[PDB]
C-alpha cells in the first residue's frame with residue numbers, strides 16, 4: 001500500500017565526468033542559469049544539487065515527445081553536479097553514493113579520459129543505471145545548429161562532412177567503452193538499454209540533444225532503477241557543506257535522499273565537538289531549478305519530501321561535518337542511541 005501515486009519519491013541523478021567536459025554547462029542550459037561563468041577558474045569545487053519538478057521536465061522534453069504519448073511517472077528529479085578535477089575523487093565518490101541513476105559526460109572530441117574511467121568504476125560498483133552524454137557536438141566542423149533541438153532532428157540537417165566526422169568520433173568512443181568492457185550504442189540505435197550503454201550526443205552550448213538526454217534519464221528512473229526507489233521509505237539524509245548565510249546563521253546544506261524532513265524536526269548529525277543535537281528552525285530550498293551550492297533566495301517549507309537539496313537553519317551547527325549522515329529523532333527513538341549511530345559509520 002506504499003507503492004502508489006500517493007507516495008512517490010523524486011529520484012537522484014548524478015552527473016559525472018572528466019574535467020571540463022561540460023557537466024556544469026549542461027546543467028546551466030537546462031536551468032537557464034550561468035553558474036559556470038561564476039566559478040573561479042571555471043572549476044566546480046563542491047557537490048551541487050538542482051531540483052527539477054516533473055512539469056519542467058515535460059516542457060523541456062516536448063520536442064522529443066511531440067505527440068505527448070510518453071508517460072511521466074516521477075514527480076521530479078534532483079540532479080547532482082560533481083567536480084571533474086582530478087583532486088576531488090572524494091566528492092565524486094560522495095555524489096555517486098547518493099545517486100540512483102547517472103549521466104556520464106564524455107567530450108566527443110576527446111573520448112574517455114582518466115576521470116571518465118574513475119566515474120565508470122564508481123557507477124559499475126553500485127550498479128547505477130546510466131547513460132552517456134557525448135557532449136560538445138557543436139565542435140564538429142561545420143555543425144549547423146537549431147537551439148534546444150532534439151538530436152535526431154538536428155543531425156538530419158547536417159552536411160556529409162559533419163556526418164562522417166560524427167561517425168568516426170562515435171566509433172572511436174564505442175571502441176574505448178568496449179576496451180573497458182561496456183557495450184554502447186547511439187541511443188536510437190540501441191536494441192537494449194541494459195545490454196548496452198546508451199550514448200546521447202549533446203551540446204551544452206546550443207542545447208541540442210539535451211531533450212533526448214532528459215527523456216532518457218526519466219526512462220532510467222522508471223524502467224531501470226529499482227522500483228522501490230520510485231516511492232518514499234525511511235528517512236535518509238547527508239550533510240554536504242556548512243555555510244554561514246546572512247539572516248540564518250551557520251546553516252547546513254543537505255541532500256535528503258529518502259523520506260520526509262519537517263520544520264521543527266529534532267536532528268542529530270556528526271560535529272567536531274561531538275554529536276550535534278538540534279531542531280530545524282527553517283527548512284529551505286532554493287527556487288526550483290536553481291543550485292543549492294550558489295547563494296540565492298530561498299523558499300521556506302513546513303515539510304520537504306525526498307529527494308531534495310535543502311538548507312537547514314538551526315542552532316549549534318558550527319562544527320557540522322560534511323559527509324555526515326543526518327537522522328531525525330522520532331517519538332520512540334533514544335537520542336543518545338542516534339548519536340552513537342551517526343558517529344559509527
Ligand SMILES: Nc1nc2c(ncn2[C@@H]2O[C@H](COP(=O)(O)OP(=O)(O)OP(O)(O)=S)[C@@H](O)[C@H]2O)c(=O)[nH]1
Pocket residue numbers: 017018019020021022023024025026036042043044045082083084085135136137138139202203204205206
Ligand atoms: N563548444 C562547446 N563548449 C562547451 C560545451 N559544454 C561545455 N563547454 C565548455 O567547456 C568548458 C568547461 O565547461 P564546464 O561546464 O566547466 O565543464 P565541467 O565538466 O563542469 O568542468 P569541471 O566541474 O569538471 S572543472 C567551458 O568553457 C564550457 O563553455 C559544448 O557543448 N560545446
Ligand SMILES: [Mg+2]
Pocket residue numbers: 023024025043044082083084
Ligand atoms: Mg563543473
Ligand code: NA
Pocket residue numbers: 019020021041042043044
Ligand atoms: Na570546468
